[PDB]
């Protein structure tokens, strides 16, 4: 869109400005969803390989949950950074272009004539 | 093949596309497309059967011709600006030239008759490589030059893929043929959104890639290439058919499965661009895809099909291949809808 | 024993499994460590520290 | 713009039509595909030499050494359909009807 | 490590193990011709790996605990019933033959795996290239009809194609009346009332089809019972022959790696046995097949993958 | 050692062309690295005025650049003269 | 519980929804102007950097 | 798109002759495209059969354009409705009925009436409004 | 580049010949070096849509 | 004349393409490209580009096309069609003739040909630049940078050719 905004060090999964954001809390509802997906991956992995579903090599389940949460947690940092970046450069353009975003004038509903169409 | 010699052919083409996504020079992009073709041909003919010999010939002639058409698109742009860098094109006919040239490398519009025949001839393992990796290379260039794209030029290509992919998919029998037509239909979705915002084009690519591996490697496990052959797998491996059904629903697009990931955002994106008749046709004609997904779903797991006595012998032996990444690929293609705001990472 | 041949996964691959817990604890402890320094850095840079 | 370039530009187009139209033989199609990169070679050299783009002289040599790789692949595929079918006629290459 | 492609790169080459005594000798013949006896004598003379005739329950011996399963659960066909009445409406005629062909296919695969791995020669009676004589006999005698023939030879095309013919084939040709002369002594109720023409139809289909369609691909050396007791001669001919005119003594290491890819994948060699072609006599209905599979699943060990059944005492399941 | 020497000897016994090729190619890859004249080759390569020595605007404070072509200041290829 | 919980909670929900709705409506306007006049941070399409130019004297004096 | 521009430039209803000629030109040109594909993907026996396929396809398409342009224009000023979508609705069925007689089937004629009648109103529907089918990437 | 590893690694593979005003062998001009110098130096840090 | 010599050669170049684009017998089609290949170098030669032109003779005309017709020699049917044979082949040839005649006529009278690319119809010579090249050939000194600036080009084109050698055996192996 992003893409080539001023300062775009390539292949940078976490630019330094991301360190100024509130880090995703470990109890994040998004984060635990990654953990839930990891468990579902473990259940399928035993199901596909004719293994006793739940109680079948819980070590594999631990790896799947750990990988999904860890890979997830770095994803939210980038997810929150870009989302915050979108609003940040946004909030400055409106200042630099005030006439491009004129502010409306106070007109209460007592003066606004919204037509009343009867309903039958 | 010799395992070490098939390895380099598998990943010379890995590198061929890798060059395209990193090259800033027009000639180098053609170079990666050349290694893309030069390493694709042997893999298609690993088994050496007349279907593969035909499939390689059809694939080579189509891709080679598109590559040649790409070159003069490069030359004309050079002839009118003298710039070898990849940016917005500086002349109309050059822009029109490569859009068709890049299209034929990918294959969405009438330049799609090769896609079904080539995958039908070649083996299932090479099928996923053709239908998944061989689409990032053309798409990387298109996302790069999306600014200069001609909005009329691309969108009519986009529907003609989904309408053709939607229509002909009903009559197909061979599972590879059905998979190819769905790939054509899926190809239309991100190509349509390509002129507006390439983030959803990449997002559709990633999700579609995830769904296709889940589809292909499950079929590889089923060791089946026909609908009837896939139908039998209900008895020997009932779990696989149940997973066959969930990915079919996912890759159909029904919510809350991950097939609603690309469409919904794509529908939303064009709606912000005032193009509102355009999304409705694609969403509605997407049901044509769902019908032969339903047709496969009915014959695979929802209703069991007659089996054969000899397949009691099949139960006596366990599988051998570990089908790497299959468990994580399935889950990453079914229940990722609640993680939709992750699309901000791509841009 | 049932099966005539000793099965491929019958013997627990102790080298492989112990490795997986090794990555699991390593992956977690880095995650815990990652969160603390991120929290501390956000605590510092954003003026609250 | 000089008529020598339009002479080259049609040369692509007539080569393009021959490659697409087909008559009987894949040899001719492979021949038509070579006129493609040929006319590309003179067109590339003509622009590059005219503009004194010194580094761009790279591309003409690079162009055909990779275009010739098509011949290395295209010629090989023909003999295989020649070994199995007999004549390499495109009409023979119809097994993948489905 | 298994023969995964990594093992090929860092080591094992099939051609190293192969020696002169690496044949696929099959001793074929008529019913009760001593072909099993002669194969045993040849194999123990050369120290090869003898494989007994692939019966209906051979597959059970190749898995599980080597215990033949219930006939409904392991083929749904009894050979004895076929000898009793082959024209039975249950379709035991072709069902037995088709399952036997799959049994031979599994038998042939195990012999090929041992030969490619150990390098020791293998011996097996009949073959996947010789089971056609029974059905062709089963056809001319009215035991089956045309549809069974079409399915069987099509299965031969889609399975036997990627199985080259053996180095040398032994054929003990006892005359049909002489086979009759011994079967009254055998005294197995089902196999008494064979049709003399059927066993006659064993012999001729052996005569102008087996050897002629095997001669061009391998040496065919033929005896009778008088040379079966004289096995010291039938073995020196094996020494004398160069194993020529055969596609085995020309393949390189690349094909052997491809062959071991096929054989080590047991379901792959069985994948084309269960063709979705719906012959009425062998097609198991959905309800019966589902119940049979449930019967198979509740069997011990078969519930999960090998090494993953705590019912049979597989500890450490929680951490496999 | 012993087998390696015997390996070379039988290589020269039946395959003398390839050992000649490998030896020459083996040398031809490593003397250019530790060559003592390679830097000389570069030095004379830059000391070939294909392009004109465009003059510089005399603003002072630069003594190294000669005011006159024959002036002693500036680079000299006296080394190129004797070698 | 008391109705003051529902009342205060909902009006806070309405306040959050209003800002969310207002920002999206402003977003379409900001993104529209960016893609038209292009003087903003994002949507900046790549251009050739001014560092690749060789400013050293050339063989031809006028060039 | 000068050929498409002809239909738009001529006012609706007024200049029925110009509308009819432009409309059948659009249909004929469309008939050329589909007929060219038909010969390509599915070749006939010889050239005489090839022009036979072209003759049928072009005549059908030109007829649909001719009848649609004629009926739409002749209904507009007669009813004095230069904006009502109904002026194109009976035009779509006019083509729909025309196609039905061309292939000689009542059922396909009724379906063509219903489908073309809806689309023709829909195509008109966007002309009064600002509907865009290939909208430029504003955002 | 779609993945600008060129910029991240700081090593040149393709930008040397991308423009004719870049470094040339023995410093020979590319005919229109003077003009494209003005255009490129007009376009840096301006953006694609603006610079056109 | 002599001023239009590049135009003259360019004209033979186009009609040379019609020779093989018409898809005649593969040997005869190769010959039609052989002359087309020959004249095209002369077009390059007249613009300079000796080395680039000479390759078209050496590694393409005496190179790629030699094994090209060589394959047609041992392949193909026993009855090779003579250029006239099928009426379509001569129809294609005359078809190629009418395209080059109409444009060239349009080129030399109105000079305002706009087909696809707008091209003004002047002589070949009104495009050449001016200036002395010193003591170095521009073409020669450009492609000599294969080993001084052609770094990433050599690494990739060399690697693919090695893969080119391996792909050709793997396809020709016959499994
Ligand atoms: C985002 C989220 C989604 C994507 C996530 C990312 C992962 C995506 C892929 C998941 C796994 C897919 C897979 O393997 O499915 C099974 C599927 C079937 O496996 P199979 O049954 O073994 O059959 C494949 C071959 O026929 C088997 O042939 P074989 O028997 O000869 O065995 C070959 C195999 C087995 O290994 C060997 O043969 C050993 C080789 C030894 C010599 C080399 C040693 C060094 C190797 C490593 C170097 C690093 O080795 C390889 O394939 C090596 C490939 C890498 C080469 C590296 C060196 C290049 C120089 O895999 C394939 O078909 C492979 C296709 C190529 C790779 C995947 C391409 C599709 C995806 C592309 C897009 C990815 C996302 C992009 C964004
Ligand atoms: C592998 C062998 C080839 C690469 C290493 C040897 C060549 C090094 C070289 O010239 O690098 C040029 C440059 C570094 O430049 P350089 O400093 O060596 O030379 C600059 C020369 N001028 C000033 C004339 C431009 O590196 C590359 O281009 C990287 C090439 C790819 C390396 C990795 C390949 C895998
Ligand atoms: C989004 C909408 C829904 C989408 C998905 C819909 C899926 C079904 C749709 C219909 C599918 C087709 C029709 C049915 C096909 C059945 C497929 C099949 O294989 O069925 C038979 C099979 C027999 O079971 P078996 O393989 O023997 O394994 C038993 C358990 N060991 O059965 C199986 O193999 C199934 C085994 C299931 C195992 C479930 C294990 C559950 C574990 C729960 C753990 C809970 C932990 C809680 C922790 C709380 C604290 C955090
Ligand atoms: C000084 C330091 C080096 C000293 C010399 C070291 C090398 C010794 C070489 C010994 C002979 C070559 C190796 C060998 O044993 O080759 C066997 C085999 C011969 O094949 P063939 O003749 O067909 O016979 C068998 C089939 N009938 O070989 C083959 O089949 C393959 C032959 C490949 C030949 C390649 C030749 C390339 C060109 C010459 C070498 C150039 C430099 C290469 C790099 C060298 C680096 C050190
Ligand atoms: C105000 C502006 C417009 C004014 C004029 C009115 C609109 C243009 C004229 C009508 C165009 C749409 C109606 C269809 C025209 C083409 C008809 C045609 O091709 O008929 C032949 C054939 C049908 O018969 P067939 O199935 O072959 O069976 C007989 C076999 N012997 O065809 C087929 O088999 C294939 C199906 C038909 C061809 C594909 C679809 C063609 C139409 C697409 C939309 C065109 C829209 C044109 C107007 C807007 C754009 C300018
Ligand atoms: C955009 C172009 C898409 C072309 C797709 C071509 C293949 C699929 C369509 C097809 O085969 O025929 C469609 C159309 C009508 O076919 P028709 O002439 O009625 O013949 C029927 C009996 N074969 O025949 C055609 O050739 C029309 C295709 C374009 C319609 C617009
Ligand atoms: C089974 C077939 C359908 C069954 C019936 C379903 C309901 C019938 C109507 C379907 C409506 C689909 C399109 C509605 C999406 C939202 C449109 C909307 O909100 O209204 C817009 C209406 O605008 C449209 O043009 C929307 C589409 C109108 C209908 C045309 C497409 C739908 C019909 C064809 C596809 C579906 C039919 C099936 C075809 C196989 C307002 O935008 P505007 O035009 O005012 O934009 C501002 C300015 O004027 C610029 O335009
Ligand atoms: N129906 C049928 N029966 C088969 C087939 N192959 C083998 N059999 C049966 O296999 C059984 C064993 O073969 P026999 O030759 O009788 O065995 P044997 O008495 O040990 O004698 P030798 O084989 O000479 O050692 C016989 O009852 C055969 O009819 C087949 O394809 N179809």
Swiss-Prot record, chain B:
The lineage of its organism: Eukaryota, Metazoa, Chordata, Craniata, Vertebrata. Core subunit of the mitochondrial membrane respiratory chain NADH dehydrogenase (Complex I) which catalyzes electron transfer from NADH through the respiratory chain, using ubiquinone as an electron acceptor. Essential for the catalytic activity and assembly of complex I. GO terms for cellular component: mitochondrial inner membrane; respiratory chain complex I. It is an enzyme of class 7 (translocase). InterPro entries: Complex_I_Subunit_2 (IPR050175), NADH_DH_su2_C (IPR010933), NADH_UbQ_OxRdtase_chain2 (IPR003917), ND/Mrp_TM (IPR001750). The keyword Disulfide bond does not apply. Its EC number is 7.1.1.2. Keywords: Electron transport, Membrane, Mitochondrion, Mitochondrion inner membrane, NAD, Respiratory chain, Translocase, Transmembrane, Transmembrane helix, Transport, Ubiquinone. One of its GO terms (biological process) is mitochondrial electron transport, NADH to ubiquinone. The chain crosses the membrane at residues 3-23, 25-45, 59-79, 89-109, 149-169, 178-198, 200-220, 237-257, 274-294, 325-345. GO terms for molecular function: NADH dehydrogenase (ubiquinone) activity. It is found in: Mitochondrion inner membrane. Pfam families: NADH_dehy_S2_C, Proton_antipo_M. Core subunit of respiratory chain NADH dehydrogenase (Complex I) which is composed of 45 different subunits. Interacts with TMEM242. It is a multi-pass membrane protein. This is NADH-ubiquinone oxidoreductase chain 2. Belongs to the complex I subunit 2 family. It catalyses: a ubiquinone + NADH + 5 H(+)(in) = a ubiquinol + NAD(+) + 4 H(+)(out).
UniProtKB/Swiss-Prot annotation, chain D:
InterPro entries: NADH_UbQ_OxRdtase_chain4L/K, NUOK/Mnh_C1-like. It is an enzyme of class 7 (translocase). GO terms for molecular function: NADH dehydrogenase (ubiquinone) activity. It is a multi-pass membrane protein. One of its GO terms (biological process) is ATP synthesis coupled electron transport. The keyword Amino-acid biosynthesis does not apply. It comes from the Eukaryota. It catalyses: a ubiquinone + NADH + 5 H(+)(in) = a ubiquinol + NAD(+) + 4 H(+)(out). Its EC number is 7.1.1.2. It holds the Pfam family Oxidored_q2. Belongs to the complex I subunit 4L family. Core subunit of the mitochondrial membrane respiratory chain NADH dehydrogenase (Complex I) which catalyzes electron transfer from NADH through the respiratory chain, using ubiquinone as an electron acceptor. Part of the enzyme membrane arm which is embedded in the lipid bilayer and involved in proton translocation. Core subunit of respiratory chain NADH dehydrogenase (Complex I) which is composed of 45 different subunits. This is NADH-ubiquinone oxidoreductase chain 4L. It comes from Sus scrofa (Pig).
Curated annotation (Swiss-Prot), chain J:
Its EC number is 7.1.1.2. It holds the Pfam family Oxidored_q3. It is a multi-pass membrane protein. The keyword Transmembrane helix applies. It is found in: Mitochondrion inner membrane. One of its GO terms (molecular function) is NADH dehydrogenase (ubiquinone) activity. Core subunit of the mitochondrial membrane respiratory chain NADH dehydrogenase (Complex I) which catalyzes electron transfer from NADH through the respiratory chain, using ubiquinone as an electron acceptor. Essential for the catalytic activity and assembly of complex I. Core subunit of respiratory chain NADH dehydrogenase (Complex I) which is composed of 45 different subunits. Belongs to the complex I subunit 6 family. This is NADH-ubiquinone oxidoreductase chain 6. It comes from Sus scrofa.
């Amino acid at each position: 869109m992003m893409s080539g905004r001023p300062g775009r060090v390539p292949l940078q999964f976490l630019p330094n400005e991301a360190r100024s954001l509130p880090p995703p809390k470990l109890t994040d509802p998004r984060l635990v969803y990654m953990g839930f997906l990891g468990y579902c991956s473990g259940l399928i992995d035993n199901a596909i390989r004719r293994r006793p579903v739940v109680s079948a090599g819980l070590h594999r389940q631990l790896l799947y949950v750990t990988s999904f949460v860890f890979f997830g947690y770095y994803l939210l940092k980038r997810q929150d950074y870009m989302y915050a970046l979108r609003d940040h450069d946004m909030f400055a353009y409106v200042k630099s272009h005030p006439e491009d975003f004129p502010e409306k004038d106070k007109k209460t509903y007592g003066e606004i004539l919204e037509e009343f169409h009867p309903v039958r | 093949m010799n395992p070490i010699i098939y390895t380099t052919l598998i990943m010379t083409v890995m590198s061929g596309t890798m060059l395209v996504m990193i090259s800033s020079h027009w000639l180098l992009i053609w170079i990666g497309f050349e290694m893309n073709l030069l390493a694709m041909i042997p893999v298609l003919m690993k088994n050496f059967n007349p279907r593969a010999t035909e499939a390689a010939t059809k694939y080579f002639l189509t891709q080679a011709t598109a590559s040649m058409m790409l070159m003069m698109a490069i030359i004309i742009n050079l002839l009118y600006s003298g710039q070898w860098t990849i940016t917005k094109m500086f002349n109309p006919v050059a822009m029109t030239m490569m859009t068709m040239a890049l299209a034929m490398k990918l294959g969405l519009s009438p330049f799609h008759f090769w896609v079904p025949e080539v995958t039908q001839g070649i083996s299932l393992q090479a099928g996923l490589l053709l239908l998944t990796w061989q689409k990032l290379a053309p798409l990387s260039v298109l996302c790069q030059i999306s600014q200069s794209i001609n909005p009329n030029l691309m969108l009519t290509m986009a529907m003609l893929s989904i309408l053709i992919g939607g229509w002909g998919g009903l009559n197909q029998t061979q599972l590879r043929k059905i998979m190819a037509y769905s790939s054509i239909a899926h190809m239309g979705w991100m190509t349509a959104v390509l002129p507006y915002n390439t983030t959803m084009t990449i997002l559709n690519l990633l999700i579609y890639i995830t769904m296709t591996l889940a589809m292909f490697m499950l079929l590889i496990h089923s060791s089946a290439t026909t609908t009837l052959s896939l139908s039998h797998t209900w008895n020997k491996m009932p779990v696989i058919t149940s997973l066959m059904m969930v990915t079919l629903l996912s890759m159909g697009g029904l919510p809350p499965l991950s097939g609603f990931m690309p469409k919904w955002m794509i529908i939303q994106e064009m709606t912000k661009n005032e193009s509102i008749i355009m999304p409705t046709l694609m969403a509605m004609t997407a049901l044509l895809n769902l019908y032969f997904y339903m047709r496969l779903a009915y014959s695979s797991s929802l209703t069991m099909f007659p089996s054969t006595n000899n397949m009691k012998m099949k139960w006596q032996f366990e599988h051998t291949k570990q089908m790497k990444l299959l468990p994580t690929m399935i889950v990453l293609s079914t229940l990722v809808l609640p993680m939709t705001p992750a699309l901000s990472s791509l841009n | 024993k049932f099966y005539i041949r000793e099965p491929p996964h019958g013997s627990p691959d102790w080298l492989k499994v112990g490795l997986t817990l090794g990555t699991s604890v390593f992956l977690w402890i880095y995650l815990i460590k990652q969160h603390k320094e991120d929290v501390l850095e956000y605590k510092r840079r954003n003026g609250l520290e | 713009m000089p008529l020598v370039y339009m002479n080259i530009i049609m040369a692509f187009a007539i080569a393009l039509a021959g490659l697409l139209m087909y008559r009987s033989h894949l040899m001719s199609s492979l021949l038509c595909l070579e006129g493609m990169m040929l006319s590309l070679f003179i067109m590339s050299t003509l622009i590059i030499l005219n503009t004194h783009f010194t580094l761009a002289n790279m591309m003409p040599i690079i162009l055909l050494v990779f275009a010739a790789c098509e011949a290395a692949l295209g010629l090989s595929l023909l003999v295989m359909v020649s070994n199995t079918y007999g004549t390499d006629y495109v009409q023979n290459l119809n097994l993948l009807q489905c | 490590l298994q023969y995964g492609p990594l093992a090929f790169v860092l080591g094992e080459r099939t051609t190293r193990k192969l020696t002169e005594t690496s044949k696929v000798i099959t001793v074929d013949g008529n019913i009760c011709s001593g072909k099993g006896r002669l194969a045993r004598e040849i194999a123990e003379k050369l120290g090869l790996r003898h494989f007994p005739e692939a019966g209906i329950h051979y597959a059970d011996s190749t898995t599980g605990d080597g215990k033949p399963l219930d006939v409904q659960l392991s083929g749904n066909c009894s050979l004895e019933k076929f000898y009793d009445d082959p024209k039975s409406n249950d379709g035991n005629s072709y069902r037995l033959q088709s399952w036997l062909y799959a049994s031979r296919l599994l038998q042939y695969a195990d012999a090929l795996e041992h030969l490619l791995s150990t390098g020791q020669g293998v011996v097996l009676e009949r073959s996947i290239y010789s089971d056609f004589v029974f059905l062709e006999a089963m056809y001319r005698q009215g035991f089956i009809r045309k549809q069974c023939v079409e399915h069987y030879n099509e299965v031969k095309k889609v399975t036997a194609c990627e199985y080259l013919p053996p180095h040398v084939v032994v054929y003990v040709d006892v005359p049909v009346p002489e086979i009759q002369s011994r079967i009254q002594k055998k005294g197995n109720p089902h196999e008494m009332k064979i049709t003399a023409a059927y066993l006659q139809d064993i012999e001729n289909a052996y005569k102008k089809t087996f050897l002629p369609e095997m001669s061009e691909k391998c040496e065919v050396l033929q005896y009778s019972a008088r040379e079966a007791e004289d096995a010291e001669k039938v073995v020196e001919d094996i020494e004398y022959l160069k194993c020529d005119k055969g596609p085995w003594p020309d393949q390189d290491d690349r094909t052997f790696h491809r062959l071991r890819m096929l054989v080590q994948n047991k379901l792959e060699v069985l994948n084309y046995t269960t063709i979705p072609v719906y012959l009425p006599e062998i097609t198991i209905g959905a309800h019966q097949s589902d119940r049979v599979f449930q019967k198979f699943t509740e069997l011990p060990g078969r519930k999960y993958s090998p090494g993953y059944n705590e019912d049979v005492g597989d500890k450490w399941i929680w951490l496999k | 050692a012993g087998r390696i020497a015997s390996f070379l000897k039988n290589a020269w016994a039946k395959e003398p062309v390839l050992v000649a090729s490998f030896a020459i190619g083996g040398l031809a890859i490593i003397l250019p690295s530790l060559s003592p004249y390679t830097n000389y080759a570069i030095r004379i390569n830059r000391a070939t005025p294909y392009n004109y020595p465009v003059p510089l605007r005399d603003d002072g404070n630069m003594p190294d650049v000669p005011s006159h072509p024959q002036d002693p200041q500036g680079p000299s290829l006296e080394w190129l003269k004797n070698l | 519980d008391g109705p003051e919980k529902n009342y205060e909670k909902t009006m806070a929900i309405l306040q959050i929804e209003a800002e969310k709705a207002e920002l999206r409506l402003k977003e379409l306007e900001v993104r529209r102007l960016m893609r038209a006049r292009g003087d903003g941070p994002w949507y900046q399409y790549p251009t050739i950097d001014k560092a690749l130019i060789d400013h050293s004297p050339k063989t031809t004096p006028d060039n | 798109k000068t050929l498409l521009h002809k239909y738009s430039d001529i006012p609706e209803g007024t200049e029925c002759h110009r509308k009819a000629y432009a409309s059948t030109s659009i249909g004929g040109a469309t008939g050329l495209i589909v007929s060219a594909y038909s010969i390509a993907l599915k070749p006939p026996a010889s050239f005489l059969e090839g022009v036979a396929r072209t003759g049928r396809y072009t005549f059908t398409s030109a007829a649909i354009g001719a009848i649609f342009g004629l009926t739409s224009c002749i209904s507009a000023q007669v009813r004095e409705k230069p904006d009502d979508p109904l002026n194109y609705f009976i035009g779509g069925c006019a083509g729909g009925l025309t196609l039905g007689a061309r292939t000689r089937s009542y059922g396909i004629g009724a379906a063509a009436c219903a489908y073309m009648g809806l689309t023709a109103a829909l195509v008109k529907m966007g002309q009064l409004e600002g509907w865009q089918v290939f909208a430029e990437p504003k955002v | 580049p779609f993945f600008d590893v060129q910029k991240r690694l700081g090593l040149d593979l393709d930008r040397w010949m991308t423009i004719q005003s870049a470094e040339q062998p023995h410093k020979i001009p590319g005919r229109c070096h003077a003009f494209e110098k003005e255009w490129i130096e007009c376009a840096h840090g301006i953006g694609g849509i603006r610079a056109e | 004349m002599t001023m239009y010599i590049a135009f003259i050669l360019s004209t033979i170049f186009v009609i040379g393409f019609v020779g093989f684009s018409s898809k005649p017998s593969p040997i005869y089609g190769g010959l039609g490209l052989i002359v087309s290949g020959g004249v095209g170098c002369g077009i390059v030669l007249n613009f300079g580009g000796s080395f680039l032109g000479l390759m078209v003779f050496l590694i393409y005309l005496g190179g790629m096309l030699v094994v090209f017709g060589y394959t047609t020699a041992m392949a193909t049917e026993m009855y090779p069609e003579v250029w006239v044979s099928n009426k379509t082949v001569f129809g294609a040839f005359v078809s190629g003739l009418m395209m080059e005649f109409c444009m060239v006529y349009y080129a030399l009278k109105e000079e305002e040909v706009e087909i696809i690319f707008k091209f003004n119809g002047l002589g070949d010579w009104v495009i050449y630049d001016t200036g002395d090249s010193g003591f170095f050939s521009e073409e020669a000194m450009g492609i000599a940078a294969l080993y001084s600036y052609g770094t990433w080009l050599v690494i990739v084109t060399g690697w693919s050719l090695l893969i080119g050698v391996v792909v050709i055996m793997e396809i020709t192996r016959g499994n």
